[PDB]
Subunit: 164 residues, 12 copies
C-alpha cells in the first residue's frame, strides 16, 4: 500500500499514525485523499502542534493488521483509522486494534448509521475507544484534535502517578 | 428542564444550540455537565470564535422535541445533541431532527458500539449528519470544532450561488 | 355531540416538514362538519409529549367527549402506554396517518396505538381526517341507536 | 365516472364467516352514491384467484375505470404480484380491510398490496368501503381540477 | 382441475371430499394418485362403510378455495386435504378452511418437519383440527379412518343435545 | 414410570411398544390414559389383529431414552410415541429414535401447529418417519392402524429380497 | 425511615381498566405499615410521564428517601432512560407488577427497568406492593446493621 | 395448613456456588413461620431431576398440600414440561429466584415455569423465599374466605 | 428442436411498467435464432396465474419440448409449488430475470424457482433471454452427444 | 477492445476440487472469441487475495479495459469492499458463478458483489463464462453506439 | 490420581448407532494409561439422565476425583443445568465429542456445557478421549506444581 | 514425515496480547516431537493475510506435507474461502484454538474453518497444539496402515 510522511525537525513530540482502509485511495465530495492529508498537515502546522503524521492507505486487510502490529514498536503513540468496508466485517483488525497498545480512533466519512443495514455495525469501531462518522473529510481533523488531547493528558498522567 | 447561556456583545456571529438528553444532568469520569459546558465555552473564548452557545438539558423527550422545534425560528444555525438513552428508542426526535432545518450533530460520551446490544442503534444519530461517540466530554468540543466549520462553509456557499 | 382530535409529535410542524399547516387541517375538518351539517363540537390538541396524550385520553373518560380521532405520529410505532390508554378510553378511538406507514421504513410498519384503536385510516394525507369524522359520526350514530333499541326491551 | 371494486378470496363468504353478506356491502355502497348524488358507475368483482385480481387490474388500464377500491383479503399479506400490479395501475388504488390487520396474528400485520396503494382503510367493517368511495371521489375530483389547471398554461 | 367419484346406491351415509393440492397429480414411492384413490375406495368398500368419496386435484390455489366454498352447500360433512406446497404459503386457504363449516384433515405424504426449513410450517394444517404427515399414501387411509369416527361421533352428539 | 401389558396366547405376531410422554398420565376431553389404552386394545382385539401392546408412561426423559434403547433387543418391531413437551426440546430422544432400529410414529393429542410458537417444532417427530397430531385420543388408533401396515409390508419385503 | 412509591402510566386508571383503585392500593400499604408497626413514612407519586419518573428518581438522591418501590408499567419494557436512572439511584429500587408480564404478549416479556432494580415482584396483584414493603424493610434493616458493623472497625 | 417447597438443580450446592446453604434457607423459612405464628407445615424437596419435579408436582394433587413455592432453577428457562405440570397443579404455585434472571445472560431471561405460576419473586436472594411464604399465606387465606362466602349462598 | 418460454405475472405489461414490450422481447429471440441459424421451434406463454405456470410445466413432460426458459417474475420469490414443478420437469429449466433481484428489496433476494432451475441469468434486461437460448442450445447439444456416447457402449 | 477476467479464491484449484481446470476455462473463452470473430483482447487474473481483486479493479480504471467479468468466489458473499470497488469501476462488471449459489448453504445465498455488478450469471458451469463474453460484447457494442448517437447531437 | 469419565445419553449405543462400542473406547483409554505409565485411576459412568450427570458432578466435589472428562452428548446443546454444574466442579472438566458439532445441524453448533468446561476436543472420534487424558494429566501436573510453588512462599 | 503448522492473524503478537510467545509455542511442539521420538518434520508459517493461508494450503497439495495443523484465528469465524481451501486439502487438517471460542462473544461461536477440518481442539491454551501433533501422528499412522491393508488385496 501507500504511505506519505513529512519529516519534522528535532528541537513534547507526538508521532501519530493514520491508516486509510480499502478503496479510500479512490475519492476523485469532489476531494481526494492526498488532499485530505494536506488538510490534516495544514491543521497541525497551523494549530501550532508538535505532531508528526504518517499516512497509510491499503486495500489489504493483512496490510492493515501488519501496520498496526508494527506501531507496537513504540514509535507513535496513537492511531487514526478508517478501516473502510473492513469496519463491518473484519474481526481480525478489531483484534489487531484491541492489542494495539495505544489510543485508536475510528473515522468514517459517511454516517454508517444512515446507510445499508450491513454497514451499521463496525467491529473495529467497537474496539477503538472513539468513533467519528458522518463528517466528510472534516472528520479526520476532529480525530486529530482529539488524539492530541488524549495523548497530552496521558503524558500529564504518566508524570502523575510516577512520583509517589 | 435546565438552560444556561452567557451573553455575547455585538460588534460572522454564529448562535449554536447544545441539547443534553436525560440523565446527563447527573455526571458527578469524575466531571459534571456544567463543567462540560465551561470546557465548551473555554474552547470558544479560547479558539478566538464569534460563537454564542445555549445549553439545555432535560429528561423529557417532549422537551427535547419542543426545543428543536423552537430553534426553527431561525436563531441558531445548528444543533449539538446528546439524546442520551432516547437515541436508541425515540423515533419522535429523529423526526424532530430531520425537520430541524439546520446542521445537527450527535454526541455520546460512551462508545455505544461497544455496549449492550440495545445501545448499538441510534435513530437520532442516523438523522444527524454526523455522530461522535466514545470520547468522553472531549467529544463535545469535537462537535463544536466541527459545527464551526460546517456553518462557515455554508455562509461561504450561500454567498456562492447568490451572485449568479 | 363533542369529539376530540389528538395530534402527536412534530405534527405541528407541517409547512416546514405538501405545503399545508396543521391549522389548515383543522379548519378543513370544520369545513367538512360546518358543511356536512353534523351536530359535532370538535376540539384540537397537539403535543410532542407521550404523557400529554396519555393524560388527555384519561381526561376524555369524563362525559362530553364521545370519541377521539388521533394521530399519535411517531409514538404510533413505540408507545405501548398510549395503546394501553386508548384501550381504556371505552369509547371510539380512530387512528389517522397522513402517510402510508406500510410504505416507509421498517420501524414505521407496525402501530401499537393502531391495534388498540378500532380502525386506522392511513396514507390519505389530510383527507383521512375528514374520513375519520365521517366514520366517527357513523359509529356514534349506530351505538346511540342500539342503547335505545335495548334499554327499551 | 366509473370505479372498480375488487373483492378478494373468501370475501364472498360473509354470512357464514357480524351477520352481513358481500351483496349487502355492495348495495350499501350504491346507497352511499345513489344518495351522495355523486356521478359514479361502480362495478363489483370478487375472486378467490390471485391471477384474477392481477388480470382485472391489468384490464383497468383501458379507459372507463378511473380508480380501483380493493380488498385483496389474505393475498394482502403475501401477494407481491398483486402489489406489483397495483403499481402499474397508474390511477388511484385504495385498499380496504373489514378488520384491523394490525390487531390479529403476526402474519397479517404487513400488507404488500397496501404499500403499493396510496392509502389503506382498515378495521371499520363495511363502513370502510363507503369511506373509500368518499376518498376516491375526492382524489379524482382534485386530479381532474389539476390537469385542467396546467393543460391550460 | 380433476375430479373422480364413484356413485353409491341409496338403501348413515357420509359423503366425504378429498382435495389434492398442486403437483400431486404427478406421482409416477412408484405409486400414482389414481392409485392412491382406489386404495382409499378399497379401504371403504372393504371396511364395510357407507362412505361416498369425491376426489379432487388441482394446481390452482383459487380452485382449492372454490371447492371448499362449494362443500358449504351442506353435501359432504367433512374434508380430507393435502394442500401440497400451498400448505406452507397460503393463508387464503387457511382461511377458506377456518370457515369450512365441518371437519377438515390435512394429510402429507412426506414428513414436512423433516425437510427444508421452509416446509416446516403449514398454515393450512394449523387450521385443520388434525394433521397427518410422513406416512406416504398410507396417510390418506388414516385420515379416512379418522374422518369416519369424527362424523360418527358428531351424529351421535347432534342426536345427544337435540332431545332435551 | 408406569407400564401395562396384556398377555397374548401363542398359536404373524407383531409386538408393538407405546411410549407416553410426561404429564400424559394426567388426563382426567374428559378421558384418561388407561382409557386411551383400552381404546387401543379394543381396536386390535376388534380389528382381528395379532398384535401385542406394551404400554409405557413416564415423566423422565432418561426413562424414555432407556425404554427405546431396551426395544433394540429385538422384541417389538415398532414404537408409537407421544414425547409430550419433550417433543419440542429433547434432541436426546430424537437421537434415541434415529438409532431405534425400527418404525417409530409420533402421536400428539393436540394440533401443535395451532398452539404457542414454542410447541411448533418437535425434533422427535422430525426423527419418527410419521407424525399424527390433532386427533385427540383417536390419534393413537391411527398410529396403530398405520404401524400394522408398515410392519406387514416390511415382512412381505424381507421375504421379498431374501430369495434371490 | 421514608420510602418512595412510584406508579407509572395508566396505573391511576384502576377501577375503569379486578374492581380496585390506586388509592385503595396505597391505603393498603398504609394498613400493612400502620399495622406492621414499621417506622416507615411512605409517599405516593403516580405519573403518565417518562420524564417525571426520571425526575423523581433523580430527586430521591437527596437524603430523606432511603428506598424506592416502583411500577414503571408500560415504560418497564421500553424505557432505557428510567433503567439508567434507577441505576444511579444508589439505594434500593424494587420493581412491582400487578400482572405476570412473562404471561402476556411478547413485547411485555423483558423489563429494562426490572434488570436495573435489584429485584422484581410480579403477578401478585396488589399484594405485591405489601410484598415490596416487606422486602424494603428487610434490606434497609440489613444495610443499616452492616454500615455499623464496619464503620465500627 | 401444609406447603411444598421445591428446589431445582444445583440449588443444593449453595456454599460452594454469598456464603449460605440451602439448609439455612429452609430453616430461615421455618424461623419466619415459627415466628410469624402462621399454621404452616412446610416440606422441602430439592432435586437435579426435571422428572422429579414433575412427579412431585403431580403428587401434590392429593389433599394435604395447599400450595407450592418452587425454584425450578435452570429448568425455569427450558422446561415446558414443568410448566405444563405447574398448570395442572390447580392450586397456587409461586416461582422464586435467588437472582434477577432479567439481569444475566440472554438464555436466562424468559421463564416458562414462571409464566405458568401465578407470580414470580426474583432477585431478592433468600429473602424471596420468606416473601413467598408471605404471599402463599395471603392467597390461601383469601381463597378459603371466598369458598365460604359462596358455598354459603 | 422445440423450446418453451414461460413469462410470469405482470411481464405482459412492459411498455407501461425502459420503453420495450413483451412481444418485442419474443421477436428478439426469434431474430437471435432466425439469425443464429439454430434449429429451434420457440413457443411463448405468459400468465398471471401461479397454477398456469404449474400446468404448463407439467404439460411439457410430453415429448416435443426439450427445454424451458422461464421468468417466474414475482412468483420467483414465493412459489414453492412452481419450484417443485420445475424439479420434476426432468429437462433443462433456465430462469431469466430482467433485473438483478439481488439489487432490489429484501423480499426479492432469494428465488425458490431459481434454486430449482439449473441456472439463473439476471439483470441483463432482455439480452438475458438471448443469453438463455444461447445456453439451452449448448446444454441440449451436449446432452444429445452424451446419450449417444453411452447408448453406443 | 480489451476485457479483464477476474477469478477469485480457490478457483485455480479446479481439477482437484467435474474434472476441468481453470486454464481450460480460459482457453474455452478464447475458442469462443477466436471463433466468434469478435475483436476482444482477454486477460486472465486469478487470486486468493481480497485485496488483489480490489487492486485489480482499481487498476482497470485506466483506459484499455472496457469491461470486467468476475467470479469473486467465496468473497461474493462477504466482501463489501469488493462490491464497493466494483461500483466505482464505472464500466461494465459481470459476475459469473460456476454453481447456482441459490442452491447451496444459507451463507452462500446473497452476493454483495453481485448486487454491485449489473448482472449475474450462475449455475451454468463454465458455459457461464462464454455467456458472459456474449453479454459484454453486446453492452459494449450498445454503449459505443449511443455515445456516438448523442456526441453527434 | 483418580479421574472421572462421564458419557451422556445414547453414547452406550455405539455399535448399533464406525463399528466400535463404548466399552472399547474405555479400554482404549486404559491402554493409553496402562501404557503411558501415568498414575491414573479412571472411572466410567454412562447415563441417559440429565439429573444423573448433575448428581455425579456434584458427587465429584468429594476428594479422590481430581478431574472430569465428559461427553454430555445431546445435552451439550441444551442443558444449562449441567453447565451450571460443571462450573461449580472447581476442578478441571474437559468436554469431548466424537463428531465435529460445528459440522452437523444448526441445533448442535453451540454447546452450553462446552463453554463451562475449560476446553473442548471434538471431531476426533475416540482418539479425542485419549487426547483428553493427555490434557488432564498435563493440567493436573501443572496445578500441582504451582500450589507447591506458592504454599512454599 | 513432514507437517505444516499455520498460525493466523495476530497470533504472532503473543507476549503483548498468559505471558508466552508464538516462538515458544513452536519450540514446545519441537520438545514434544524431539521428545516423543516421532519421525516428524514441522514447519511453521504465521500470517495476518487470509490470502496467504489459502495460498499455503494450496501449496501443501504437493507431496512432502502429509498434514496441516491450523489456527485460523479471527478468520475462523468469517473466512468461507479458507474453509473452502481446507476442504480441497485432501489430507488431514486439524484446527487449534488457544481459547474456548464457545466462551467469548457471539461472533466467535461458529467456526467455518473448523467445520471443514476433521476436528477441532479449543480452549487448552498451547497444550492444544501438542494435542494436535498427538492426533495428527495417530491419523497418519492409521491411514498409512490402511492403504497397505488394501493395496495388498
Ligand atoms: O469512511 C467511510 O464512510 C467508510 O468507512 C468508507 C467506505 C465504506 O465501506 C464504509 O461503510 C464507510
Ligand atoms: O452520551 C452517552 O454516552 C449516552 O448517549 C448517554 C447515556 C446512555 O443512555 C447512552 O447509551 C450513551
Ligand atoms: O401522520 C403520519 O403519517 C405519521 O403518523 C406521523 C409521523 C410519523 O412518525 C409516522 O410514521 C406517520
Ligand atoms: O377485509 C379484511 O379485513 C381482510 O382483508 C380479509 C381477509 C383476511 O385474510 C385479512 O387478514 C383481512
Ligand atoms: O404430501 C406432501 O408431502 C406435500 O404436502 C406435497 C408436496 C410438498 O410441497 C409438501 O411440502 C409436502
Ligand atoms: O399430545 C400432545 O398434544 C402433546 O404432545 C402433549 C403435551 C404437550 O406438551 C405437547 O405440546 C402436545
Ligand atoms: O403492573 C403491571 O402489571 C404492569 O407493570 C402495568 C402495566 C403494563 O404496561 C405492564 O406490562 C404490566
Ligand atoms: O435461583 C435462581 O437465581 C435461579 O432460578 C437458579 C439457578 C439459575 O439457573 C437461574 O438462571 C436462576
Ligand atoms: O424479470 C424480473 O426482473 C423479475 O423476475 C420480474 C418481476 C419481479 O417480480 C421480480 O422481482 C424480477
Ligand atoms: O464459482 C462459483 O460457483 C463460486 O463463486 C465459487 C466458489 C464458491 O465460494 C461460491 O459459493 C460459488
Ligand atoms: O459427537 C458426540 O459425541 C456428541 O456429543 C454426541 C451426541 C450428539 O447429540 C452430539 O451432537 C455430538
Ligand atoms: O487461538 C484462538 O483462541 C483464536 O483462534 C485466535 C484469535 C481469535 O480471533 C479467535 O476468536 C480465537
Amino acid at each position: 500500500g501507500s504511505s506519505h510522511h513529512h519529516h519534522h525537525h528535532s528541537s513534547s513530540h507526538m508521532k501519530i499514525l493514520v491508516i486509510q482502509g480499502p478503496n479510500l485511495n479512490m475519492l476523485g465530495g469532489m476531494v481526494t485523499l492526498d488532499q485530505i492529508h494536506e488538510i490534516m498537515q495544514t491543521f497541525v502546522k497551523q494549530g501550532n502542534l508538535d505532531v508528526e503524521l504518517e499516512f497509510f492507505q491499503t486495500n489489504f486487510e493483512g496490510e492493515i493488521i501488519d501496520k498496526i502490529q508494527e506501531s507496537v514498536g513504540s514509535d507513535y503513540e496513537g492511531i487514526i483509522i478508517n478501516p473502510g468496508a473492513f469496519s463491518h466485517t473484519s474481526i481480525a483488525i478489531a483484534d489487531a486494534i484491541m492489542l494495539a497498545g495505544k489510543p485508536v480512533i475510528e473515522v468514517h466519512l459517511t454516517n454508517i448509521q444512515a446507510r445499508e443495514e450491513f454497514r451499521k455495525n463496525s467491529y473495529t469501531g467497537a474496539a477503538c475507544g472513539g468513533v467519528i462518522m458522518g463528517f466528510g473529510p472534516l472528520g479526520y481533523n476532529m480525530a486529530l484534535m482529539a488524539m492530541v488531547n488524549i495523548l497530552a493528558e496521558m503524558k500529564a498522567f504518566q508524570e502523575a502517578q510516577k512520583n509517589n
